[PDB]
PDB file of N, CA and C in Angstrom:
ATOM      1  N   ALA A   1     -19.129   1.834  11.274  1.00 49.98           N
ATOM      2  CA  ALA A   1     -17.811   1.317  10.950  1.00 49.98           C
ATOM      3  C   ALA A   1     -16.775   2.465  11.056  1.00 49.98           C
ATOM      4  N   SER A   2     -15.493   2.105  11.166  1.00 47.82           N
ATOM      5  CA  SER A   2     -14.460   3.126  11.049  1.00 47.82           C
ATOM      6  C   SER A   2     -13.922   3.183   9.613  1.00 47.82           C
ATOM      7  N   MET A   3     -13.502   4.370   9.197  1.00 49.51           N
ATOM      8  CA  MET A   3     -12.955   4.581   7.838  1.00 49.51           C
ATOM      9  C   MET A   3     -11.468   4.357   7.896  1.00 49.51           C
ATOM     10  N   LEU A   4     -10.976   3.595   6.961  1.00 50.90           N
ATOM     11  CA  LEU A   4      -9.540   3.397   6.831  1.00 50.90           C
ATOM     12  C   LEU A   4      -9.089   4.256   5.653  1.00 50.90           C
ATOM     13  N   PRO A   5      -7.836   4.686   5.687  1.00 50.70           N
ATOM     14  CA  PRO A   5      -7.312   5.367   4.490  1.00 50.70           C
ATOM     15  C   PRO A   5      -7.144   4.382   3.317  1.00 50.70           C
ATOM     16  N   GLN A   6      -7.364   4.912   2.133  1.00 49.01           N
ATOM     17  CA  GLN A   6      -7.102   4.234   0.906  1.00 49.01           C
ATOM     18  C   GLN A   6      -6.162   5.047   0.035  1.00 49.01           C
ATOM     19  N   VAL A   7      -5.390   4.336  -0.769  1.00 48.15           N
ATOM     20  CA  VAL A   7      -4.429   4.997  -1.624  1.00 48.15           C
ATOM     21  C   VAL A   7      -4.608   4.385  -3.041  1.00 48.15           C
ATOM     22  N   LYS A   8      -4.195   5.156  -4.051  1.00 45.67           N
ATOM     23  CA  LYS A   8      -4.175   4.697  -5.416  1.00 45.67           C
ATOM     24  C   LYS A   8      -2.717   4.595  -5.870  1.00 45.67           C
ATOM     25  N   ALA A   9      -2.346   3.472  -6.456  1.00 47.86           N
ATOM     26  CA  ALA A   9      -1.025   3.278  -6.946  1.00 47.86           C
ATOM     27  C   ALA A   9      -0.743   4.103  -8.194  1.00 47.86           C
ATOM     28  N   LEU A  10       0.417   4.765  -8.171  1.00 48.00           N
ATOM     29  CA  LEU A  10       0.903   5.494  -9.353  1.00 48.00           C
ATOM     30  C   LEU A  10       1.962   4.798 -10.109  1.00 48.00           C
ATOM     31  N   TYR A  11       2.527   3.768  -9.516  1.00 45.54           N
ATOM     32  CA  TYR A  11       3.639   3.022 -10.135  1.00 45.54           C
ATOM     33  C   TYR A  11       3.395   1.564  -9.783  1.00 45.54           C
ATOM     34  N   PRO A  12       3.890   0.628 -10.585  1.00 44.46           N
ATOM     35  CA  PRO A  12       3.751  -0.778 -10.215  1.00 44.46           C
ATOM     36  C   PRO A  12       4.789  -1.111  -9.154  1.00 44.46           C
ATOM     37  N   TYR A  13       4.593  -2.159  -8.361  1.00 43.85           N
ATOM     38  CA  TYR A  13       5.580  -2.607  -7.388  1.00 43.85           C
ATOM     39  C   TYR A  13       5.539  -4.114  -7.312  1.00 43.85           C
ATOM     40  N   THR A  14       6.719  -4.727  -7.359  1.00 47.52           N
ATOM     41  CA  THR A  14       6.891  -6.129  -7.122  1.00 47.52           C
ATOM     42  C   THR A  14       7.470  -6.279  -5.723  1.00 47.52           C
ATOM     43  N   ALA A  15       6.725  -6.910  -4.855  1.00 45.95           N
ATOM     44  CA  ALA A  15       7.212  -7.222  -3.485  1.00 45.95           C
ATOM     45  C   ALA A  15       8.593  -7.898  -3.535  1.00 45.95           C
ATOM     46  N   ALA A  16       9.519  -7.467  -2.659  1.00 44.60           N
ATOM     47  CA  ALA A  16      10.865  -8.054  -2.562  1.00 44.60           C
ATOM     48  C   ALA A  16      10.924  -9.269  -1.678  1.00 44.60           C
ATOM     49  N   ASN A  17       9.961  -9.398  -0.790  1.00 40.80           N
ATOM     50  CA  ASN A  17       9.900 -10.524   0.168  1.00 40.80           C
ATOM     51  C   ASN A  17       8.474 -10.710   0.644  1.00 40.80           C
ATOM     52  N   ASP A  18       8.213 -11.737   1.476  1.00 41.95           N
ATOM     53  CA  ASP A  18       6.843 -12.020   1.847  1.00 41.95           C
ATOM     54  C   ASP A  18       6.201 -11.053   2.810  1.00 41.95           C
ATOM     55  N   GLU A  19       6.909 -10.050   3.289  1.00 42.02           N
ATOM     56  CA  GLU A  19       6.284  -9.068   4.178  1.00 42.02           C
ATOM     57  C   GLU A  19       5.663  -7.936   3.347  1.00 42.02           C
ATOM     58  N   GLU A  20       5.919  -7.885   2.047  1.00 41.70           N
ATOM     59  CA  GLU A  20       5.549  -6.757   1.179  1.00 41.70           C
ATOM     60  C   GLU A  20       4.407  -7.142   0.270  1.00 41.70           C
ATOM     61  N   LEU A  21       3.705  -6.136  -0.247  1.00 41.49           N
ATOM     62  CA  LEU A  21       2.553  -6.370  -1.132  1.00 41.49           C
ATOM     63  C   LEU A  21       2.824  -5.839  -2.541  1.00 41.49           C
ATOM     64  N   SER A  22       2.656  -6.720  -3.547  1.00 40.66           N
ATOM     65  CA  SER A  22       2.730  -6.315  -4.937  1.00 40.66           C
ATOM     66  C   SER A  22       1.448  -5.595  -5.410  1.00 40.66           C
ATOM     67  N   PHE A  23       1.645  -4.655  -6.348  1.00 42.25           N
ATOM     68  CA  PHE A  23       0.505  -3.964  -6.990  1.00 42.25           C
ATOM     69  C   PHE A  23       0.810  -3.401  -8.373  1.00 42.25           C
ATOM     70  N   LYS A  24      -0.258  -2.993  -9.089  1.00 42.06           N
ATOM     71  CA  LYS A  24      -0.177  -2.389 -10.363  1.00 42.06           C
ATOM     72  C   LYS A  24      -0.679  -0.976 -10.259  1.00 42.06           C
ATOM     73  N   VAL A  25      -0.383  -0.267 -11.315  1.00 41.25           N
ATOM     74  CA  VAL A  25      -0.872   1.135 -11.442  1.00 41.25           C
ATOM     75  C   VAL A  25      -2.385   1.142 -11.412  1.00 41.25           C
ATOM     76  N   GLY A  26      -2.930   2.008 -10.590  1.00 45.20           N
ATOM     77  CA  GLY A  26      -4.332   2.188 -10.404  1.00 45.20           C
ATOM     78  C   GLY A  26      -5.001   1.337  -9.339  1.00 45.20           C
ATOM     79  N   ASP A  27      -4.285   0.357  -8.805  1.00 42.93           N
ATOM     80  CA  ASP A  27      -4.831  -0.396  -7.667  1.00 42.93           C
ATOM     81  C   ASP A  27      -5.191   0.530  -6.504  1.00 42.93           C
ATOM     82  N   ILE A  28      -6.359   0.263  -5.894  1.00 41.84           N
ATOM     83  CA  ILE A  28      -6.838   0.962  -4.732  1.00 41.84           C
ATOM     84  C   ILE A  28      -6.577   0.089  -3.512  1.00 41.84           C
ATOM     85  N   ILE A  29      -5.683   0.569  -2.639  1.00 37.44           N
ATOM     86  CA  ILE A  29      -5.179  -0.246  -1.544  1.00 37.44           C
ATOM     87  C   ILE A  29      -5.614   0.371  -0.227  1.00 37.44           C
ATOM     88  N   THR A  30      -6.032  -0.479   0.710  1.00 38.69           N
ATOM     89  CA  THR A  30      -6.505  -0.015   2.000  1.00 38.69           C
ATOM     90  C   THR A  30      -5.402  -0.033   2.970  1.00 38.69           C
ATOM     91  N   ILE A  31      -5.255   1.037   3.751  1.00 38.93           N
ATOM     92  CA  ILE A  31      -4.129   1.135   4.641  1.00 38.93           C
ATOM     93  C   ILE A  31      -4.523   0.771   6.060  1.00 38.93           C
ATOM     94  N   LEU A  32      -3.833  -0.240   6.605  1.00 36.08           N
ATOM     95  CA  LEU A  32      -4.133  -0.751   7.944  1.00 36.08           C
ATOM     96  C   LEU A  32      -3.279  -0.102   9.005  1.00 36.08           C
ATOM     97  N   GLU A  33      -2.185   0.545   8.606  1.00 33.79           N
ATOM     98  CA  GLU A  33      -1.188   1.011   9.504  1.00 33.79           C
ATOM     99  C   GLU A  33      -0.106   1.850   8.731  1.00 33.79           C
ATOM    100  N   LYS A  34       0.432   2.895   9.357  1.00 32.38           N
ATOM    101  CA  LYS A  34       1.510   3.696   8.749  1.00 32.38           C
ATOM    102  C   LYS A  34       2.740   3.661   9.609  1.00 32.38           C
ATOM    103  N   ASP A  35       3.871   3.433   8.991  1.00 35.56           N
ATOM    104  CA  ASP A  35       5.140   3.533   9.704  1.00 35.56           C
ATOM    105  C   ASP A  35       6.158   4.372   8.909  1.00 35.56           C
ATOM    106  N   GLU A  36       5.930   5.651   8.901  1.00 38.10           N
ATOM    107  CA  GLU A  36       6.746   6.632   8.099  1.00 38.10           C
ATOM    108  C   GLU A  36       6.711   6.283   6.606  1.00 38.10           C
ATOM    109  N   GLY A  37       7.846   5.934   5.979  1.00 39.62           N
ATOM    110  CA  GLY A  37       7.878   5.638   4.543  1.00 39.62           C
ATOM    111  C   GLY A  37       7.237   4.335   4.051  1.00 39.62           C
ATOM    112  N   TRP A  38       6.936   3.399   4.963  1.00 39.96           N
ATOM    113  CA  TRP A  38       6.324   2.125   4.628  1.00 39.96           C
ATOM    114  C   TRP A  38       4.943   2.108   5.300  1.00 39.96           C
ATOM    115  N   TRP A  39       3.931   1.825   4.480  1.00 41.86           N
ATOM    116  CA  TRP A  39       2.571   1.687   4.957  1.00 41.86           C
ATOM    117  C   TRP A  39       2.124   0.286   4.810  1.00 41.86           C
ATOM    118  N   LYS A  40       1.275  -0.197   5.712  1.00 42.59           N
ATOM    119  CA  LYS A  40       0.797  -1.579   5.587  1.00 42.59           C
ATOM    120  C   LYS A  40      -0.548  -1.608   4.851  1.00 42.59           C
ATOM    121  N   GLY A  41      -0.582  -2.306   3.720  1.00 41.93           N
ATOM    122  CA  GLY A  41      -1.738  -2.346   2.863  1.00 41.93           C
ATOM    123  C   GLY A  41      -2.437  -3.692   2.756  1.00 41.93           C
ATOM    124  N   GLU A  42      -3.710  -3.617   2.361  1.00 43.63           N
ATOM    125  CA  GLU A  42      -4.514  -4.754   2.054  1.00 43.63           C
ATOM    126  C   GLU A  42      -5.186  -4.523   0.716  1.00 43.63           C
ATOM    127  N   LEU A  43      -5.107  -5.555  -0.099  1.00 43.30           N
ATOM    128  CA  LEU A  43      -5.654  -5.561  -1.467  1.00 43.30           C
ATOM    129  C   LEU A  43      -6.144  -6.988  -1.760  1.00 43.30           C
ATOM    130  N   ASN A  44      -7.449  -7.116  -1.991  1.00 45.57           N
ATOM    131  CA  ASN A  44      -8.030  -8.380  -2.384  1.00 45.57           C
ATOM    132  C   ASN A  44      -7.595  -9.505  -1.536  1.00 45.57           C
ATOM    133  N   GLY A  45      -7.587  -9.265  -0.228  1.00 49.51           N
ATOM    134  CA  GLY A  45      -7.285 -10.342   0.687  1.00 49.51           C
ATOM    135  C   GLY A  45      -5.783 -10.578   0.911  1.00 49.51           C
ATOM    136  N   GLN A  46      -4.898  -9.838   0.234  1.00 51.13           N
ATOM    137  CA  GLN A  46      -3.448  -9.942   0.477  1.00 51.13           C
ATOM    138  C   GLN A  46      -3.026  -8.766   1.296  1.00 51.13           C
ATOM    139  N   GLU A  47      -2.123  -8.959   2.239  1.00 49.37           N
ATOM    140  CA  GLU A  47      -1.700  -7.897   3.123  1.00 49.37           C
ATOM    141  C   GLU A  47      -0.188  -7.801   3.080  1.00 49.37           C
ATOM    142  N   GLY A  48       0.353  -6.555   3.088  1.00 46.92           N
ATOM    143  CA  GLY A  48       1.800  -6.413   3.248  1.00 46.92           C
ATOM    144  C   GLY A  48       2.182  -4.970   3.171  1.00 46.92           C
ATOM    145  N   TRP A  49       3.468  -4.724   3.359  1.00 45.75           N
ATOM    146  CA  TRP A  49       3.971  -3.338   3.479  1.00 45.75           C
ATOM    147  C   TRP A  49       4.247  -2.849   2.092  1.00 45.75           C
ATOM    148  N   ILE A  50       3.987  -1.575   1.875  1.00 47.03           N
ATOM    149  CA  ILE A  50       4.192  -0.919   0.569  1.00 47.03           C
ATOM    150  C   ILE A  50       4.978   0.379   0.714  1.00 47.03           C
ATOM    151  N   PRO A  51       5.732   0.753  -0.318  1.00 45.49           N
ATOM    152  CA  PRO A  51       6.490   2.035  -0.240  1.00 45.49           C
ATOM    153  C   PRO A  51       5.592   3.194  -0.551  1.00 45.49           C
ATOM    154  N   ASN A  52       5.483   4.178   0.347  1.00 46.77           N
ATOM    155  CA  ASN A  52       4.485   5.195   0.186  1.00 46.77           C
ATOM    156  C   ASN A  52       4.722   6.160  -0.995  1.00 46.77           C
ATOM    157  N   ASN A  53       5.931   6.165  -1.550  1.00 43.28           N
ATOM    158  CA  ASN A  53       6.219   7.018  -2.692  1.00 43.28           C
ATOM    159  C   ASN A  53       5.560   6.434  -3.975  1.00 43.28           C
ATOM    160  N   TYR A  54       5.147   5.166  -3.946  1.00 44.31           N
ATOM    161  CA  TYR A  54       4.495   4.596  -5.083  1.00 44.31           C
ATOM    162  C   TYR A  54       3.000   4.907  -5.220  1.00 44.31           C
ATOM    163  N   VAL A  55       2.439   5.558  -4.223  1.00 44.88           N
ATOM    164  CA  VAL A  55       1.027   5.697  -4.114  1.00 44.88           C
ATOM    165  C   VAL A  55       0.668   7.113  -3.723  1.00 44.88           C
ATOM    166  N   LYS A  56      -0.638   7.403  -3.858  1.00 42.70           N
ATOM    167  CA  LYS A  56      -1.186   8.651  -3.419  1.00 42.70           C
ATOM    168  C   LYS A  56      -2.495   8.445  -2.665  1.00 42.70           C
ATOM    169  N   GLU A  57      -2.504   8.975  -1.450  1.00 44.00           N
ATOM    170  CA  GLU A  57      -3.629   8.769  -0.533  1.00 44.00           C
ATOM    171  C   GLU A  57      -4.821   9.495  -1.066  1.00 44.00           C
ATOM    172  N   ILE A  58      -5.972   8.819  -1.051  1.00 42.41           N
ATOM    173  CA  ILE A  58      -7.229   9.413  -1.473  1.00 42.41           C
ATOM    174  C   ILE A  58      -7.845  10.302  -0.370  1.00 42.41           C
ATOM    175  N   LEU A  59      -8.079  11.596  -0.656  1.00 42.65           N
ATOM    176  CA  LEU A  59      -8.455  12.542   0.412  1.00 42.65           C
ATOM    177  C   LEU A  59      -9.954  12.425   0.719  1.00 42.65           C
TER     178      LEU A  59
END
């Protein structure tokens, strides 16, 4: 398999529209794609863009 990046949320986020993904502090989110400040995440079957300042990539 290929490894995807994962990030851990440091702040909660409420999606502003249907292209974005909501999360809570400590959620582990899988990154499908990066576009500078917005990353595309997947969490429990939901997919959407997230602000990268809310999270920290797991090394």
